[PDB]
Design a binder for this molecule. Structure first.
Ligand SMILES: CCCCCCCC/C=C/CCCCCCCC(=O)O[C@@H](COC(=O)CCCCCCCCCCCCCCC)COP(=O)([O-])OCC[N+](C)(C)C
Ligand SMILES: CCCCCCCC/C=C/CCCCCCCC(=O)O[C@@H](COC(=O)CCCCCCCCCCCCCCC)COP(=O)([O-])OCC[N+](C)(C)C
Ligand SMILES: CCCCCCCC/C=C/CCCCCCCC(=O)O[C@@H](COC(=O)CCCCCCCCCCCCCCC)COP(=O)([O-])OCC[N+](C)(C)C
Ligand SMILES: CCCCCCCC/C=C/CCCCCCCC(=O)O[C@@H](COC(=O)CCCCCCCCCCCCCCC)COP(=O)([O-])OCC[N+](C)(C)C
Ligand SMILES: CCCCCCCC/C=C/CCCCCCCC(=O)O[C@@H](COC(=O)CCCCCCCCCCCCCCC)COP(=O)([O-])OCC[N+](C)(C)C
Ligand SMILES: CCCCCCCC/C=C/CCCCCCCC(=O)O[C@@H](COC(=O)CCCCCCCCCCCCCCC)COP(=O)([O-])OCC[N+](C)(C)C
Ligand SMILES: CCCCCCCC/C=C\CCCCCCCC(=O)O[C@@H](COC(=O)CCCCCCCCCCCCCCC)COP(=O)([O-])OCC[N+](C)(C)C
Ligand SMILES: CCCCCCCC/C=C\CCCCCCCC(=O)O[C@@H](COC(=O)CCCCCCCCCCCCCCC)COP(=O)([O-])OCC[N+](C)(C)C
Ligand SMILES: CCCCCCCC/C=C\CCCCCCCC(=O)O[C@@H](COC(=O)CCCCCCCCCCCCCCC)COP(=O)([O-])OCC[N+](C)(C)C
Ligand SMILES: CCCCCCCC/C=C\CCCCCCCC(=O)O[C@@H](COC(=O)CCCCCCCCCCCCCCC)COP(=O)([O-])OCC[N+](C)(C)C
Ligand SMILES: N#Cc1ccc(COC[C@H]2O[C@@H](n3c(NCc4ccc(Cl)c(Cl)c4)nc4c(N)ncnc43)[C@H](O)[C@@H]2O)cc1
Ligand SMILES: N#Cc1ccc(COC[C@H]2O[C@@H](n3c(NCc4ccc(Cl)c(Cl)c4)nc4c(N)ncnc43)[C@H](O)[C@@H]2O)cc1
Ligand SMILES: C[C@@H]1CC[C@@]2(OC1)O[C@H]1C[C@H]3[C@@H]4CC=C5C[C@@H](OCCC(CO)CO)CC[C@]5(C)[C@H]4CC[C@]3(C)[C@H]1[C@@H]2C
Lengths: 1105, 123, 168
């Protein structure tokens, strides 16, 4: 059948015949005009009932010959005289002519259909989610008329309550009723076109206009906007989405609302609002001016079980007014003030135009309506009575329906709306259960409702109390939220492929992920021997610092808006933000590498650079208060983050703007100094004091007070615990600035000897200089090995991956390996004893030296970049050599575009040779540098250096070369100039930052380097080696200073927020917004006074007269 | 003239990338020394014996839905980018505050009549 | 994917048709360059025959590229394919090489010294100059890159907008 609609649903229709009102009107012979006009009680014209079996009776007049017990018929049984069959009217309305052509959809079923079928196709076939509210508007359906404010404002709520809860407004469909009125609101608001309210509006197929347009299976409908003035049949209202057109099996008749609009309401209220939550979906009944039947329908919902509440409105019309009217008269519900118990019946008369026996009947309905005034409300637009019908609608389900504040809250949680609960659940004198607050936080966290996290943690829910192993452990094991589907990937990696069926994530696992994401040696609390024990055993089952544990959860499961909220709370704010920048930055890298669908990497890279920018912006807010303590923040051992440091995390995340802040540079200077006060002393004195040891005793050092913010090793702390002469040397030699200027002056004494060897002739055996040269390199190489093995990194494969990601550690490797190819072939050779440079082995080993030298002059840029002016220019020559590879290839086509024709045109007898690989590249390269070879152009000329190259075709090379240089000296070499000139600021700005970042890795390498330079370093090696076989820094604070620093961080965080809030509220754009929104409101509250004042005037013009 | 040719030349490049890719997407597999084979195959057989985005009828609808929504947003966003802008809020604010001046001062009049009234009605 | 459908999907990929022509063209320019530089006897060497083969078969690719073009009337097909810097430069380079091969193969060859038949001389200097059309074409290949493309598409807009300084 291919269509689940008609495969399941069916259409009912009359199959027998029952003449409705047999008596013909006129046209003397009845027989034809009778049958031609006299409809069946079925519905339509009797002749129209095709359904062949009836049509073999329509042939004469009907079924059941003429009279033949004319009384007997008169029921039209809607199962026997009425069989059903598969649907042939179900499709999609297009609303022909609609101004962007708002769409909807329809089906056509039999009212005996069971609600299981309507629900399942609604959520499967029509493919929707179960709502979170059902606003079934059982109001009055007579195209009625209102005042603008209530036409306008009342929608401002009704729409808003339904878009904020994904509702399904369930009207009567028809455009001559309650449907007609919500559409007036649905358009005035427009819902900023989206998946807005998914209105259903069930109605029949009997009273419907242009039924024939939308006949056919799964068929688009040319349904047309007929505002024909009379049109007994009615159009469906415009803005309504999905429709149902239940065909009773009869034109004209009513009834195909309640048979389903009853069942649907209950049947949705039978279903669970959400996976986590376990309530019933709420039903709320709204009333626009009702009627004699509605005012009983109102009562029915009051009388249902579950007691579905109702919302009426003062000033839409007859019923909503009267139900609101008696709500004023009746007090307690049970009363009816007897002084006016038919005086309302005086009003019940005038409004409707009722009679008497129904007047008490309406009044009767009014009584049971009031008997529960509890679960029913009124909308008094004329006053300030719970404004904006939203609150009333949303609230009304909570006040009336007896449910605990838990059962209240959990609904508000499902509806992503605190403002209700903030003022209607979290109200004075409330009976808050002991664990309901806790059990709600379980739901708000998993469902990603930060706003309720805020609400609960405000009203009092300590994360310290609500954070056990089992609670936390499953927060990972949930799909009921914006889950990261990548977390399960990182886990199955660190398990080395293992992947059980369901796999309860254990906290061992999350640890091993963070150990893998944060890298290096970051040991989480989740993996330590203590925690491993207690986890295999289950307030000791709690965590000390919860918001350090949830901040990980909020970031692993990619829940940013939760992460930031959980960041501002708690403590260690700078630290947490830099961990997050590492985690996100670390997940992004794993996403790219291990792809399955959309990377979400730029989503994470944006999430890192958000946290990673708070730290920078939190630092400057601390550097501007007390620059000293703000340098202690970057260095204190954290103790909740694996004994790491607020700066070693930034360096781990390659977060250049932090290490390149002016606090991470004034500290690094303060360590570069050491115990020296080099603002008083001068670099002249250090260079002297090195080559003059006893001049160390005239250098002005720093007190232990001036080295509080400066992390130290254990030994320097001891020399400041346990200045004397002996401690006045140790503080010099173990200074980074001294270890530098004590290596430079060695290296600059290495390059002056090596240079001497390279230039001066070299006999069989190395001269005294060349032995010293080998000594440096050898001992220097050892310094480069021990620099690797004793590196911070863990697995050797990672130690052998950071030290080779450095331009100068490769260039050392190439230069230390190469010099020992050189010393090998220089010392290891036969030495002809007649002339050197007749042993190509000897020759070779030298030319290794004379070329390796370039590695060693170029290294002075590692020394020259120490300066704040020279560093950048050194860090630009990388970014200019890189970003011009493509111009320079274009400059090599042109070179061979010219070199091949010229060597072909000028030397036309050349056998194959390697000279044909130089001479097509040689002179055309030296032309770029202004050497024109002017007496070799026009080789046939009289002034030629090449008078033998004159031959056929050699008059062409002056032209080719003219064309050549115009390209290689005017177009292309001045394209470079324009390249550099326009890429200068944006590389100079960076190269400062790449420099200020690399200053970290440089200083903190001398702060672990031997005192003694690479000719004599071998002593300090043997000392450390000999003793390590026989026998980094820390910011040592006292327990009192740990508090003072802790106080510093707290205040500095609090200001960061308090300043930005004012920088936003003080800005003009924001004051225009408020001013605008006030001045809107002002216009309203003035003009209403302007009205009212105009009533107090026309009053007093007539009261006394 | 470097930025304003570099900005263009990107765009002229990204445009010419169309005519380039969509020429290999109709080019023979086999390069211009051996292409003669793929020619003879196509020639011999064409005497003897562009792309399309093949959707299913279901996907034609889902794409049709995609266009519809994306149009509707384009308008709904720009309308707000205009109504949310400051220049526009100054315009309204201005025009309201003009109107406000009027509807206040007329009350200011009227209130001054309800006062001189009650100073004399009961006396 | 099966083995037989796992080849067809490779070879009929545009990126493959590119890197399978580049490595041919870059094997054409390495032979042509060899011919141009090295002396040239009465008959074409194995290299120079392969050189002619590329151009000839390449020319056919340029004809079928026209006739089977999207455009309608031939006068419009012959107006889009000549609005392209490299399809003109091919036309000039395919027409010119066959003036070169014409005067190189079609000549008397003095049998004592080449470069004493100005016909032979001529046909070569056609080769040694046509070559510039074929190195310059690597900018059609080098402009594939997102960094190199622009710099290739600037050398037009700098050569054009400075004609007037260069007359001064
Ligand atoms: C931090 C990581 C980066 C640094 C890496 C550090 C490691 C560096 C890596 C080095 C690897 C490079 C290769 C080894 C060098 C020699 C190669 C060679 O050609 O030898 C030659 C000499 O061979 C001899 O035996 C005679 C000279 C003594 C050898 C001294 C070299 C080894 C020193 C290494 C000290 C390194 C340890 C430094 C301290 C740690 C062999 O040829 P020949 O005999 O001359 O030929 C005679 C031919 N004829 C007879 C025809 C004339
Ligand atoms: C025919 C002649 C042709 C020209 C010949 C060759 C000449 C040219 C040189 C060639 C040397 C080969 C290295 C090229 C550099 C690659 C890297 C780069 O571009 O920059 C990178 C680093 O860059 C560096 O670390 C070094 C930069 C090159 C300096 C060149 C030496 C200058 C002195 C030589 C004096 C010699 C004088 C004596 C000579 C006897 C930075 O790039 P980036 O954009 O920041 O990318 C991010 C980096 N990241 C991944 C680490 C985050
Ligand atoms: C601009 C203002 C300045 C003036 C303008 C005036 C224009 C008037 C020009 C007139 C040119 C014709 C007259 C010369 C021929 C006489 C014979 C002769 O000398 O032959 C010589 C060949 O030399 C040539 O063929 C010279 C180049 C000819 C082309 C000129 C450029 C085209 C115009 C511009 C367009 C360019 C396109 C630009 C592209 C961007 C041979 O003699 P040889 O050299 O001794 O070598 C033989 C030696 N051997 C026998 C031993 C082997
Ligand atoms: C897509 C559109 C753009 C591409 C356009 C493609 C078409 C290309 C357009 C080409 C037009 C250019 C002119 C024709 C070339 C020859 C001219 C010439 O000088 O010939 C010479 C050789 O003539 C001979 O007959 C001997 C050599 C064989 C001729 C081979 C050339 C034709 C190949 C064409 C293949 C093209 C097919 C390509 C596939 C489509 C005549 O002179 P000579 O005999 O040397 O003189 C002797 C003098 N002596 C005796 C004093 C010494
Ligand atoms: C061995 C070797 C011997 C030969 C060596 C000597 C080689 C000499 C070097 C020559 C340089 C070759 C490079 C220039 C290529 C053309 C540039 C181009 O496409 O411009 C424009 C073409 O504009 C048009 O309107 C199309 C038609 C014009 C074609 C120009 C032909 C030049 C012929 C020269 C004959 C030289 C022959 C000389 C030799 C006999 C760009 O496109 P467009 O403007 O957008 O196009 C119009 C489209 N529109 C209307 C929709 C806008
Ligand atoms: C005395 C010497 C004097 C100088 C001599 C000559 C040197 C100078 C070269 C002269 C060649 C003649 C062509 C000039 C270009 C015309 C078109 C142009 O300007 O740009 C147009 C395209 O441009 C192109 O398509 C090509 C641009 C020229 C590239 C030059 C070759 C560089 C390599 C050669 C290496 C050779 C090395 C070996 C040599 C043996 C673009 O212009 P536009 O503004 O975007 O306009 C819109 C275009 N539209 C209509 C298509 C929409
Ligand atoms: C590895 C790092 C070690 C640390 C470095 C220090 C340890 C190195 C210490 C001493 C090394 C030398 C001791 C051995 C004997 C030397 C003999 C000699 O060469 O004499 C020559 C001088 O010396 C030179 O010309 C070369 C050495 C000095 C200049 C180069 C290094 C200076 C820098 C390093 C120091 C300052 C640092 C400045 C920058 C901060 C003189 O003789 P001549 O030139 O042949 O001519 C004589 C005339 N005659 C030939 C006609 C007779
Ligand atoms: C043995 C007898 C004694 C004499 C020997 C020793 C002579 C002197 C040695 C070297 C010459 C330069 C000396 C200047 C130092 C000034 C101090 C200074 O500020 O240094 C700076 C650079 O520190 C460096 O070390 C820069 C690199 C110099 C050593 C490497 C050789 C490069 C120069 C040769 C290349 C070949 C060129 C060839 C030319 C022919 C560091 O401090 P800053 O940048 O000011 O820091 C700013 C912020 N702060 C101040 C707040 C901290
Ligand atoms: C059209 C597209 C074709 C596709 C390409 C593949 C087909 C082309 C395949 C084969 C062609 C050649 C076969 C015929 C016989 C060759 C003999 C010969 O020249 O031997 C020489 C080598 O060869 C050369 O020097 C020229 C060929 C190789 C280099 C140039 C092309 C390489 C690029 C294309 C390939 C890589 C692609 C690279 C780019 C990605 C050696 O001899 P000699 O130099 O004379 O000296 C010998 C010493 N003696 C003289 C003292 C005795
Ligand atoms: C035979 C054995 C095998 C080896 C032989 C073959 C060796 C290699 C062959 C050529 C050398 C260059 C190789 C680099 C390619 C890297 C990949 C790449 O990204 O390519 C790019 C350019 O693609 C091109 O094709 C660029 C042009 C190269 C071919 C033309 C020769 C130019 C070089 C000669 C000039 C004269 C210099 C002369 C110097 C003496 C395309 O991709 P993309 O730009 O990255 O795209 C960005 C976005 N995306 C990645 C998401 C898609
Ligand atoms: N204080 C301080 C300080 C001391 C020394 C240096 C020198 O730089 C050392 C490191 O600087 C690295 N580096 C460099 N080095 C620049 C450079 C190195 C060598 C030469 Cl010959 C030249 Cl032409 C330039 N450029 C980098 C970049 N663009 N991005 C990331 N890292 C870069 C490089 O790995 C090198 O090992 C920088 C700062
Ligand atoms: N992917 C990809 C890709 C591959 C190749 C190309 C090169 O495209 C070449 C086409 O690009 C055209 N073209 C070009 N070509 C640039 C150029 C061509 C040749 C040379 Cl020697 C040089 Cl100095 C520069 N410039 C154009 C311009 N300024 N306006 C319009 N079209 C231009 C030209 O007609 C030529 O036909 C561009 C992109
Ligand atoms: C894309 C670019 C196009 C241009 C180009 O790069 C790529 O193409 C390359 C091909 C190269 C030639 C290939 C083979 C040989 C044979 C050899 O024969 C030794 C013989 C004897 C010596 O006496 C032994 O004993 C001599 C050198 C030569 C001719 C090469 C020269 C350089 C050339 C022309 C290169 C040129 C720069």
């Amino acid at each position: 059948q291919k269509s689940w609609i008609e495969s399941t649903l069916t259409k009912r229709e009359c199959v027998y015949i029952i003449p409705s009102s047999k008596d013909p009107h006129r046209c003397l012979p009845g027989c034809q005009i009778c049958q031609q006009l006299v409809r069946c009680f079925c519905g339509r014209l009797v002749k129209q009932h095709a359904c062949f079996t009836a049509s073999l009776a329509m042939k004469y007049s009907d079924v059941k010959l003429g009279e033949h017990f004319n009384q007997a018929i008169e029921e039209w049984s809607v199962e026997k005289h009425t069989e059903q069959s598969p649907t042939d009217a179900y499709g999609v309305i297009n609303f022909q002519g609609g101004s962007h052509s708002y769409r909807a959809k329809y089906v056509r079923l039999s009212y005996d259909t069971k609600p299981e079928i309507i629900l399942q196709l609604l959520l499967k076939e029509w493919q929707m989610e179960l709502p979170k509210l059902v606003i079934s508007v059982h109001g009055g359906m007579q195209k009625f008329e209102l005042h603008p404010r209530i036409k306008q404002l009342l929608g401002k709520g009704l729409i808003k309550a339904a878009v904020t809860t994904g509702a399904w407004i369930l009207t009567g469909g028809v455009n001559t009723g309650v449907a007609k009125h919500v559409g007036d609101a649905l358009k005035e608001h427009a819902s900023r076109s989206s998946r807005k309210i998914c209105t259903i509006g069930i109605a029949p197929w009997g009273v419907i206009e242009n039924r024939n347009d939308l006949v056919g299976r799964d068929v688009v409908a040319p349904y047309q906007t007929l505002l024909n003035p009379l049109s007994k049949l009615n159009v469906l209202n415009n803005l309504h989405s999905h429709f149902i057109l239940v065909d009773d099996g009869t034109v004209g008749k009513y009834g195909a609302e309640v048979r389903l609009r009853r069942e649907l309401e209950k049947t949705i209220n039978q279903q669970r609002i959400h996976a986590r939550i376990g309530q019933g979906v709420p039903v709320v009944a709204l009333i626009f001016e009702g009627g004699p039947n509605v005012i009983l329908t109102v009562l029915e919902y009051l009388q249902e079980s579950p007691p579905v509440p109702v919302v009426v409105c003062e000033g839409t019309g007859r019923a909503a007014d009267l139900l609101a009217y008696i709500h004023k008269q009746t007090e307690e519900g049970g009363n009816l003030p007897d002084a006016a118990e038919p005086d309302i019946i005086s009003t019940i008369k005038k409004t409707f135009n009722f009679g008497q026996s129904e007047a008490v009947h309406l009044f009767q309905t009014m009584m049971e309506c009031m008997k529960k005034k509890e679960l029913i409300t009124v909308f008094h637009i004329g006053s300030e009575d719970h404004q904006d019908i939203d609150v009333a609608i949303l609230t009304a389900l909570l006040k009336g329906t007896n449910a605990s504040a838990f059962d209240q809250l959990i609904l508000t949680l499902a509806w992503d709306r605190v403002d209700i609960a903030k003022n209607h659940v979290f109200v004075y004198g409330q009976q808050w259960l002991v664990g309901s607050l806790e059990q709600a936080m379980l739901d708000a966290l998993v469902m990603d409702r930060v706003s309720f996290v805020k609400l609960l943690i405000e009203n009092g829910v300590s994360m310290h109390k609500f954070l056990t192993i089992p609670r936390l452990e499953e927060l990972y094991n949930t799909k009921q939220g914006p889950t990261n589907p990548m977390l399960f990937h990182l886990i199955r990696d660190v398990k080395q492929g293992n992947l059980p069926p369901g796999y309860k994530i254990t906290l061992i696992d999350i640890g091993l992920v963070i150990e893998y994401l944060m890298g290096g040696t970051y040991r989480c609390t989740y993996t330590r021997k203590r925690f491993r024990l207690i986890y295999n055993s289950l307030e000791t089952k709690r965590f000390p610092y919860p918001l350090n544990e949830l901040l990980i959860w909020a970031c692993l499961m990619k829940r940013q808006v939760m992460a930031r909220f959980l960041w501002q709370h708690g403590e260690e704010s700078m630290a947490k933000a830099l961990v997050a920048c590492k985690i996100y930055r670390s997940m992004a890298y794993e996403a790219k590498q291990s792809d399955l669908v959309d990377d979400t990497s730029e989503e994470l890279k944006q999430y890192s650079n958000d946290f990673g920018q708070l730290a920078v912006e939190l630092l400057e807010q601390s550097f501007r208060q007390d620059e000293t303590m703000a340098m202690k923040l970057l260095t204190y051992e954290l103790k909740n983050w694996s004994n790491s440091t607020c700066l070693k995390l930034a360096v781990s995340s390659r977060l250049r703007p932090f290490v390149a802040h002016t606090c991470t540079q004034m500290l690094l200077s303060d360590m570069w100094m050491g115990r020296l006060n080099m603002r008083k002393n001068s670099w002249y004195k250090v260079i002297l004091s090195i080559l003059v040891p006893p001049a160390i005793l005239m250098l002005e050092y720093k007190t232990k007070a001036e080295m509080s913010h400066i992390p130290q090793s254990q030994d320097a702390h001891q020399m400041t615990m346990e200045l004397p002469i002996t401690r006045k040397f140790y503080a010099f030699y173990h200074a980074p600035i001294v270890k530098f200027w004590f290596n430079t002056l060695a290296y600059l004494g290495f390059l002056m000897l090596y240079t001497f060897v390279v230039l001066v002739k070299m006999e069989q055996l190395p001269s005294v200089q060349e032995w010293i040269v080998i000594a440096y390199i050898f001992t220097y190489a050892i310094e480069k090995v021990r620099e690797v093995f004793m590196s911070e990194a863990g697995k050797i494969s990672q130690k052998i991956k950071v030290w080779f990601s450095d331009y100068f550690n490769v260039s050392d490797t190439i230069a230390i390996i190469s010099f020992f190819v050189g010393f090998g072939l220089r010392f290891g050779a036969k030495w002809n004893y007649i002339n050197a440079y007749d042993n190509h082995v000897f020759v070779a080993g030298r030319l290794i030296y004379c070329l390796n030298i370039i590695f060693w002059y170029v290294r002075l840029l590692d020394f020259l970049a120490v300066n704040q002016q020279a560093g950048p220019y050194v860090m630009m020559i990388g970014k200019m050599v890189a970003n011009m590879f493509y111009i320079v290839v274009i400059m090599a086509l042109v070179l061979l575009s010219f070199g091949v024709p010229r060597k072909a045109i000028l030397y036309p007898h050349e056998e194959p040779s390697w000279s044909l690989a130089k001479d097509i590249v040689f002179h055309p390269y030296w032309m770029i540098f202004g050497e024109v070879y002017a007496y070799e152009i026009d080789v046939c000329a009289n002034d030629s250096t090449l008078p033998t190259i004159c031959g056929p075709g050699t008059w062409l090379t002056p032209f080719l070369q003219a064309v050549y240089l115009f390209v290689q000296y005017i177009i292309m070499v001045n394209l470079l100039i324009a390249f550099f000139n326009q890429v200068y600021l944006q590389v100079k700005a960076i190269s400062n930052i790449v420099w200020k970042y690399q200053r970290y890795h440089f200083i903190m390498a001398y702060h672990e380097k031997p005192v003694l330079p690479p000719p004599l370093i071998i002593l300090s090696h043997i000392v450390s080696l000999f003793c390590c076989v026989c026998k980094g820094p820390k910011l040592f604070l006292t327990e009192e200073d740990q508090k003072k620093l802790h106080d510093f961080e707290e205040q500095c965080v609090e200001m960061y927020f308090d300043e930005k809030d004012d920088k936003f509220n003080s800005g003009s754009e924001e004051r225009i917004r408020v001013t605008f929104e006030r001045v809107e409101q002002m216009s309203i509250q003035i003009k209403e006074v302007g009205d009212r004042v105009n009533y107090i005037k026309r009053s007093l013009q007539s009261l006394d007269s």
